[PDB]
Amino acid sequence: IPGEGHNLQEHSVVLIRGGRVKDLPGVRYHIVRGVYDAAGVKDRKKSRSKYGTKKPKEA
Amino acid sequence: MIQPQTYLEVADNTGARKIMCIRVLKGSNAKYATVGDVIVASVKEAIPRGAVKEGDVVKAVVVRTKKEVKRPDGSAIRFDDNAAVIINNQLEPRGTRVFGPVARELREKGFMKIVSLAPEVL
Amino acid sequence: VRMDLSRIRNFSIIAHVDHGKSTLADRILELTHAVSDREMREQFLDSLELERERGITIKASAVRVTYRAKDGEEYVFHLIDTPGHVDFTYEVSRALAAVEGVLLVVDASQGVEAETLAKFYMALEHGHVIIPVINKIDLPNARPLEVALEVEEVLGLPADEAIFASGKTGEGVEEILEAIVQRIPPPKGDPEAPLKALIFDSVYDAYQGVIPYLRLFEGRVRPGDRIRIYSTGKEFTVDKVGVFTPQGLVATEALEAGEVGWLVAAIRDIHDVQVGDTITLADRPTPSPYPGFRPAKPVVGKLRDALEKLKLNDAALTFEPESSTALGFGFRCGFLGLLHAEIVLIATAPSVVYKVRLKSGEEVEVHNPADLPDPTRIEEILEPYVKLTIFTPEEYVGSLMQLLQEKRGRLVNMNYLPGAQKRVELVYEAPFAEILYDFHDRLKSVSRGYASMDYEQAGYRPGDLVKVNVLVHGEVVDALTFIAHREKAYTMARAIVDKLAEVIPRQLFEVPIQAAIGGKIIARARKDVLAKCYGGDVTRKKKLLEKQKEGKKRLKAIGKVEVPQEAFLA
Amino acid sequence: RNLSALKRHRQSLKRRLRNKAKKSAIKTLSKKAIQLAQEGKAEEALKIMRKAESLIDKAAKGSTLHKNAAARRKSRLMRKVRQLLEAAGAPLIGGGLSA
RNA sequence: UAGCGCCGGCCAACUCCGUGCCAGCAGCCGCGGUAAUACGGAGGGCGCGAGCGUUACCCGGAUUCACUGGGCGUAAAGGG
RNA sequence: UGGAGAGUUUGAUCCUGGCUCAGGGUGAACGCUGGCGGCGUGCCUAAGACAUGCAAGUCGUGCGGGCCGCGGGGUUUUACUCCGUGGUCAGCGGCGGACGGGUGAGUAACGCGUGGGUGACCUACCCGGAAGAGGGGGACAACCCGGGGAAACUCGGGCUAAUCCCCCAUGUGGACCCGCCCCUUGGGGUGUGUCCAAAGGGCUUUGCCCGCUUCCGGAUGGGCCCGCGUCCCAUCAGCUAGUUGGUGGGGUAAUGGCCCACCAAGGCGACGACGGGUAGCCGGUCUGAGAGGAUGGCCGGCCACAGGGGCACUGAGACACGGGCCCCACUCCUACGGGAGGCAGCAGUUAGGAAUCUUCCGCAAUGGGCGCAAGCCUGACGGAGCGACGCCGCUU
Ligand SMILES: Nc1nc2c(ncn2[C@@H]2O[C@H](COP(=O)(O)OP(=O)(O)CP(=O)(O)O)[C@@H](O)[C@H]2O)c(=O)[nH]1
């Protein structure tokens, strides 16, 4: 799980391309935030694109 | 015509042309499995992917290959023994059944819709 | 019908449960229609045929008359009147304060009831004309005068006309008709205005373009044009309204200024909770429409994952997440009730989650019944609540105030409306989930199913609840235990605990699975070789009796697992 | 639902009579000559050969049969005539053969 | 109607408070355990531009399939 | 005439090599936003389904009615048979129903490439050409009537037209067998005998106008048979009984075991079969100095199917995507007797799956089909509809 926003349980539909997280074997898939019932962290003002979040109105 | 368990032809929604029977459905003592009746039974033969798969089922008569009578004494024999299949209390799973016109079938008159669905040749 | 400005009206025949709300407008209206051996049979009005199971009509849409007046208004008035019984009213309320006035014949048998009072409470906020008409040909045994006059003492209405048109055939509104135009007000059909036109009942697109039949209360409209309502309304040209005919879509121009035309085209399956909230139609600068549209609350590996079969009518439960140790199964489905059975789970009745506030400051921490076992001294559960704000007839409080204490009820502030009659206004805070079990069914019985309820919840800080668990030889068992509040410990003990016996026994050990709720146990839920050396030796019997007796001590211990869960959950 | 060209079928149905039987006739007649070919009744076989010619061009009159194949029927049949005239035929008319 | 990503080094362009072996991003090395230029926050710069990252694939690059243009004793291997 | 690199190992260094990044790009894609205009372009995953409307005819200058009209009458009335027919529905008879619209599944093979072979052929309607163009008889639809039927339809009998068929003339000649000359594997010319021809209607009445016909000229189309080219696996190493040829025969626009019987015994195979996996394929496109590699959808070329499977029929030409026949699955309709159908055509719905499109508008030209012309159709095309989806320009 890429990100800073824990969510989702025994089941939660989302979707996934992956990307190397060259830290642990075989695992290969960083699901993007906010898609389907997965959420997205906020506050992380710039770099909202990855770890998707719409821009807040300076608030 | 009558049967506890036996080989009896299903010709219905099984993936192959057979069902093993279990027994008569109503009167405790009866032995005889009279036509115009629903029955408990099961397929023994195979299926192409399909749906109904292996398990258990309750369902109904077609034909006899053992002497009917009519009140009008119409008569009609047939060295073969297909019989109907049903889901729930009543409704017919497969929307397909090749078969002919025939007589005793509708006469229970609990399941009129079927009659249309098996009208034809052979 | 060429019927330009003027004329038209708004009348509806609403009544209690089982009253033939589909008798009057059945047929033989002289208008000529529905026949050819394929008559609309009993309980016409499209429907869905599926209701044939018990003619349980869901709603009443379309069905408009034309000619029938001895050379008068010809035909100018709606004819929609959804039936049922406090099962779709609130949700279908959208049609309540829609057409002024509402007809309905009182049942010669049961007679007036709750649905009568509550049904009227709406015929006011909107502004309609009362219509008292006792139907039913009096049947074999039944009074026509008493019954009629009856609904005149309580309802407060006097000989406001009616005529025992008689339910079965009989007169058949053979009077109301020529009287309708005389016993009804006008809805004003302005030739043009900035198109006031609130959204009516949703009707799928059938295969191209939804059916949002509107009603130009003050303005005109044509086909294939633009539209804009509050939410802008991203739409375009659309087919001309044909009107709620009896069969397939009809022809002719669109509706009029107040008529009952359906809005087709423009939309195609494009479903986005765009149920609407106003005339939706656009053309100029017309202020919004009377926000007289809204329902209320819920009252009570795939499979779907999106029961969007018709969110428009959906009670209120998008499945959500729900954290249930068991097989979760059905979720937030105990609200709709009475309604069910679709096509292709287990209704665990309630599933309240609540909000936990562990000490040391840990916020909600995602409250649940299996979210982090008990690690530190609980903070007394704590959660919200719901006050009591629902009218009532006669003195039914006696049963309410008694059962109301289902959860340390607190007389929020009893009240008694004046001018009314018996109708009171009690108030008492409580919980959420709790008000989901042994409440609904009681809410009616206690007061004979009279009046409803509506709150916003309330209550926090303290509130007992504990965490009643269970025992089963093994440990932790399936996944039960929640919060035994108010002796609720043993309350359900002899109930759920005594889960029959898991249906399956497995072995002849006879493990004693108690209820380690939090004690101090609470709940309290083999070969036959011995007799074979027959006729003697209360000795050797014992010899072979100990052999197996030793296995038990070596079985239950070594025989790990012995957990036959995933049975029925009951 | 009422596309109308069924025409061709049913119309052609009368045709499936026509030529077909006509074609069939050619066989019989041909083999009758062939039958005759066995027995020295060549005159007969060639009068029938004539008739065969007739059916050939009856087919020729319109959209029935010909190509080389008509002459296949011709040249074959008559060739048979010639090989059995070889069988001590002592041939009669040129009405069945070029002189 | 102006915005997205970007800044250890490659391969461009700086600090700052937060944080303090967590929470972390990460083409590649990985970079951080109480003063972090990679981690948050600003601010700046950079980049392109109404489109910017974005994986996936495609070959290239790459002589990492080699006819052009290779190597094969100890580095991978000469058949007993 | 076109070919940039860096980085990472170990205390350090240099090799062999591996990793991944700098290049561009493709039917795309979440992410943020999102002004317009222009252009391009959008099922490559179940070749599942698929509802309603719509995709191929118009011929009364072919033929005869039913059907409404126009008005006169043949006619006094009661009327209707009729003079033009104005039309019109159906039908008979004509030519198109194979070209267009689709998608590319299954097939690795002469199917396509690329080139030849066509001395074992065929062309509807094309112009050019020799022309040719009589008598005679006969059936069908509807019509009448009976017959079955909720309808649709289904059934007998009786009439009736003609470019329909037959009838024998009639031959500028054509077809074969046998015989010839001249090229010599079914080349081109002569040889007798058979065999063989086929409506008129339209118009302004003898001329026009469309047609009708054998034969010829080439045009054009298609066809087959081979040269060569045509994807990965040798843990698939031998397989083949119309399988290989011969006779003779058989049927076929045309050869060949395409088929049969019979005679023979094979016959292919490490140059790579018999298998297996995997795939319309070439135009091509993309990469890249080049060498080269990869891929092949929108645009062009055929095959291929065009519910699954198969077979034929008509016929100028097929194995017939809006035909027939039948099985196999499926559908909805029935009044319960029976039906009627096949959206991988259009447009468009669900299921699919991350992903993908207006139930446009139109006969205008461009295209075809008819027709002597008017005339008439066609979701061909046209432009527009909508997805920064790509692309060019465009202000902020
Ligand atoms: N004996 C009798 N039956 C009546 C009378 N009026 C109505 N009914 C019968 O009762 C049935 C139900 O009445 P009706 O109100 O029209 O239907 P409904 O109660 O609205 C059912 P739903 O609410 O779902 O529409 C009807 O099918 C009708 O046959 C009556 O006066 N006498």
The answer to whether the beta carbons of residues C21 and C57 sit under 8 Å apart is yes
Is A9 within 8 Å of chain C by CB? yes
Q: How far apart are CA C265 and CA C236, in angstroms?
A: 9
DSSP C281: B
How far is residue B62 from each of residues B65, B66, C44, C382, measured CA to CA in Å? Answer: 10, 12, 37, 66
Residue C496 has, within 13 A of its CA and on its CB side, a CA count of: 21
Give the minimum alpha-carbon distance from C192 to chain A in angstroms, rounded to a whole number. 42
Report residue D76 CA to chain centroid gap: 11
Ligand 1 pocket, residue C168 CB under 6 Å:
yes
Q: Supply the range of the domain harboring residue D44.
A: 1-99
* C22 assigned ligand-binding residue: yes
Cα torsion angle, C133, C138, C139, C142, sign: positive
For A7-56, the DSSP string reads ---S-----------TTSSS----PPTTSTT-----S--S--TTTT-PPP
Spell out which chain C residues touch chain A, with contact meaning CB-CB distance below 8 angstroms. 305, 321, 323
Residue C100 has, within 13 A of its CA and on its CB side, a CA count of: 17
SS3 category, C227: strand
β-sheet with B38-42: strand ranges across: B20-24, B38-42, B57-60
Ligand 1 pocket, residue C52 CB under 6 Å:
no
List chains adjacent to chain A, taking adjacency as at least 3 C-beta pairs closer than 8 Å.
Answer: C
Best CA proximity match to C513, nearest among C557, C563, C556, C471: C471
SS3 category, C218: strand
| Closest residue, chain C, to A36 (C-alpha) | C305
Best CA proximity match to C414, nearest among C444, C436, C390, C450: C390
Structure tokens at C554: 């070596």
Structure tokens at C283: 């053309």
SS3 category, C550: helix
DSSP alpha helices (H): ranges in C185-266?
Answer: none
Contact call for A13 and C305, based on CB within 8 A: yes
Give the minimum alpha-carbon distance from A17 to chain C in angstroms, rounded to a whole number. 22
Interface probe, candidates A6, A7, A8, A9, chain C, greatest C C-beta count within 10 A: A9
For chain A, the residue count is 59
Tell me which amino acid residue D41 is: K
Q: How far apart are CA C132 and CA C176, in angstroms?
A: 10
Nucleotide nearest to A21 (CA to C1'): E26
DSSP C163: -
SS3 category, C91: helix
Read off the CATH number of the domain in which D76 is found.
1.20.58.110
**Gap from CA of C18 to ligand 1 centroid (Å):** 6
Largest CA distance in chain B: 44
Tell me which amino acid residue C118 is: A
Cis peptide before C520 (omega within 30 of 0): yes
Q: How far apart are CA C241 and CA C222, in angstroms?
A: 8
The answer to whether the beta carbons of residues B21 and B4 sit under 8 Å apart is yes
SS3 category, B41: strand
Report residue C275 CA to chain centroid gap: 18
Structure tokens at C567: 């049975």
Give the minimum alpha-carbon distance from A26 to chain C in angstroms, rounded to a whole number. 25
- Report how many domains make up chain D: 1
How far is residue D50 from each of residues D37, D60, D74, D76, measured CA to CA in Å? Answer: 15, 15, 10, 14
Chain A residues in contact with C323 by the CB 8 A cut-off are: 9
Q: Which atom of ligand 1 has the smallest separation from the CA of C43?
A: 27
